[PDB]
């Protein structure tokens, strides 16, 4: 109900994650390591990169144990590779505890680490199934859950903006970090965190579409994406939505598809062009659902680095939707692991006007959402 020592124990620079204070080895060396709710291994810098402030020196550590193991992870940017080990863990401002846990030590790595960040290893909350090499590498949270009496949960309050902060509450809820009340979603499989879009709203305004495209192939939570990401056709028709809803002004194709900036005098942004965007989710119930709804607060990110600037933080996607943290910001998220359910409150400190809020609603009926689910 109330964990003090945790609250604010996460911190960030717009547009570079959020980052909670670890320990790894003994004695304790201390790193700033990345919140990510879409990936599942402990991958830590090991090496002196030039990028990175700090990094796991595991020739200085008594408790390491090498598994004998090296790890290659490509993707379409670039790679890491690492070592695997394992070592102790203890995270300074969370439970009282201390963890053996798998390290994947990264000794080369491109277009992995942001220059000019203050993180240095990612923390993949996410399931084993899609930990690399396979599904054998025991992630974090389930390690620390095995080897403790640490309730099988966490939750995240993520607060947007050049200093962003929050919390990350590990093993429990705190009833001061959102108002109203919590409402649930399935998680559909234990892989990500995957839930089921079954209607879309743009200012009230059903988009219409059949609720399979809002989740082909697979709808995500993402601490460690920073849009909220569209299905291409689930994009497209947003987009055109979105355009129609604040045709009050013009911006050029490029805004649209974030590869432009749009600047408005200091302090005289106009909101109230915007509308607001509405996700309603599968329920606990047979036909209930619920509907989340975030601000264009969440989806215009300032832009601080330029030479009052923004960025549209939604875009198109080919793996799905990612509830990046352009969702995430608007809420108090629980990751109800225990349960098999996400849970999602109005945050109290999202960022919004004296008009409109962050909001999350229900009841709702709606029937076929089974069918919304991709196969
Ligand atoms: C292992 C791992 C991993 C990644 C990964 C994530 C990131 N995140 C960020 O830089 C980031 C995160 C949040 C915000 C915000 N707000 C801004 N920036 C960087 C490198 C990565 F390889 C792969 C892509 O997707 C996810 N989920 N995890």
Same mark, same amino acid.
């Given at each position: 109900?109330?964990?003090?020592?945790? +609250? $604010?124990?996460?911190?960030?620079?717009?547009?570079?994650?959020?980052?909670?204070?670890?320990?790894?080895?003994?004695?304790?060396?201390?790193?700033?390591?990345?919140?990510? %709710?879409?990936?599942?291994?402990?991958?830590?810098?090991?090496?002196?990169?030039? @990028?990175?402030?700090?990094?796991?020196?595991?020739?200085?550590?008594?408790?390491? !144990?090498?598994?004998?193991?090296? *790890?290659?992870?490509? /993707? %379409?940017?670039?790679?890491?590779?690492?070592?695997?080990? %394992?070592?102790?863990?203890?995270?300074?401002?969370?439970?009282?505890?201390? +963890?053996?846990?798998?390290?994947?030590?990264?000794?080369?790595? =491109?277009?992995?680490?942001?220059?000019?960040?203050?993180?240095?290893?990612?923390?993949?909350?996410?399931?084993?199934?899609?930990?690399?090499? $396979?599904?054998?590498?025991?992630?974090?949270?389930?390690?620390?859950?095995?080897?403790?009496?640490?309730?099988?949960? @966490?939750?995240?309050?993520?607060?947007?903006?050049?200093? *962003?902060?929050?919390?990350?509450?590990?093993?429990?809820?705190?009833?001061?970090?959102?108002?109203?009340?919590?409402?649930?979603?399935?998680?559909?499989?234990?892989?990500?965190?995957?839930?089921?879009?079954?209607?879309?709203?743009?200012?009230?305004?059903?988009?219409?579409?059949?609720?399979?495209?809002?989740? /082909?192939?697979?709808?995500?939570?993402?601490?460690?994406?920073?849009?909220?990401?569209?299905?291409?056709?689930?994009?497209?028709?947003?987009?055109?939505?979105?355009?129609?809803?604040?045709?009050? &002004?013009?911006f050029? $194709?490029?805004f649209?598809?974030?590869?432009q900036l749009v600047c408005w005098?200091?302090?005289?942004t106009?909101?109230?062009?915007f509308? +607001?965007?509405?996700?309603?989710?599968?329920?606990?119930?047979?036909?209930?659902?619920? !509907?989340? %709804?975030?601000?264009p607060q969440?989806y215009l990110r300032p832009v601080? =680095? +330029?030479?009052d600037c923004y960025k549209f933080a939604?875009?198109?996607?080919?793996?799905?939707?990612?509830?990046?943290? *352009?969702?995430?910001?608007?809420?108090?998220?629980?990751?109800?692991?225990?349960?098999? !359910?996400?849970? @999602?409150?109005?945050?109290?400190?999202?960022?919004?006007? &004296?008009?409109?809020?962050?909001?999350?609603?229900?009841? @709702?009926?709606?029937? $076929?959402?089974?069918?919304?689910?991709?196969?």
């Amino acid at each position: 109900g109330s964990f003090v020592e945790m +609250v $604010d124990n996460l911190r960030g620079k717009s547009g570079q994650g959020y980052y909670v204070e670890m320990t790894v080895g003994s004695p304790p060396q201390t790193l700033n390591i990345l919140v990510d %709710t879409g990936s599942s291994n402990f991958a830590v810098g090991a090496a002196p990169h030039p @990028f990175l402030h700090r990094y796991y020196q595991r020739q200085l550590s008594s408790t390491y !144990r090498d598994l004998r193991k090296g *790890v290659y992870v490509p /993707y %379409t940017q670039g790679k890491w590779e690492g070592e695997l080990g %394992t070592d102790l863990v203890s995270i300074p401002h969370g439970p009282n505890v201390t +963890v053996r846990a798998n390290i994947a030590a990264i000794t080369e790595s =491109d277009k992995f680490f942001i220059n000019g960040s203050n993180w240095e290893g990612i923390l993949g909350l996410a399931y084993a199934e899609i930990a690399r090499p $396979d599904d054998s590498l025991e992630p974090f949270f389930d390690s620390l859950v095995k080897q403790t009496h640490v309730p099988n949960l @966490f939750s995240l309050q993520l607060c947007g903006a050049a200093s *962003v902060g929050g919390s990350m509450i590990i093993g429990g809820i705190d009833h001061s970090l959102y108002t109203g009340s919590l409402w649930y979603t399935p998680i559909r499989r234990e892989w990500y965190y995957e839930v089921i879009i079954v209607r879309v709203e743009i200012n009230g305004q059903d988009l219409k579409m059949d609720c399979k495209e809002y989740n /082909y192939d697979k709808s995500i939570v993402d601490s460690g994406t920073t849009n909220l990401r569209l299905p291409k056709k689930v994009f497209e028709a947003a987009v055109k939505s979105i355009k129609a809803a604040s045709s009050t &002004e013009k911006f050029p $194709d490029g805004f649209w598809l974030g590869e432009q900036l749009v600047c408005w005098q200091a302090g005289t942004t106009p909101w109230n062009i915007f509308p +607001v965007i509405s996700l309603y989710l599968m329920g606990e119930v047979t036909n209930q659902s619920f !509907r989340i %709804t975030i601000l264009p607060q969440q989806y215009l990110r300032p832009v601080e =680095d +330029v030479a009052d600037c923004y960025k549209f933080a939604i875009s198109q996607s080919s793996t799905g939707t990612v509830m990046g943290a *352009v969702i995430m910001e608007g809420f108090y998220v629980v990751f109800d692991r225990a349960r098999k !359910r996400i849970g @999602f409150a109005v945050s109290a400190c999202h960022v919004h006007d &004296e008009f409109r809020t962050a909001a999350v609603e229900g009841p @709702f009926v709606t029937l $076929d959402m089974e069918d919304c689910g991709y196969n």
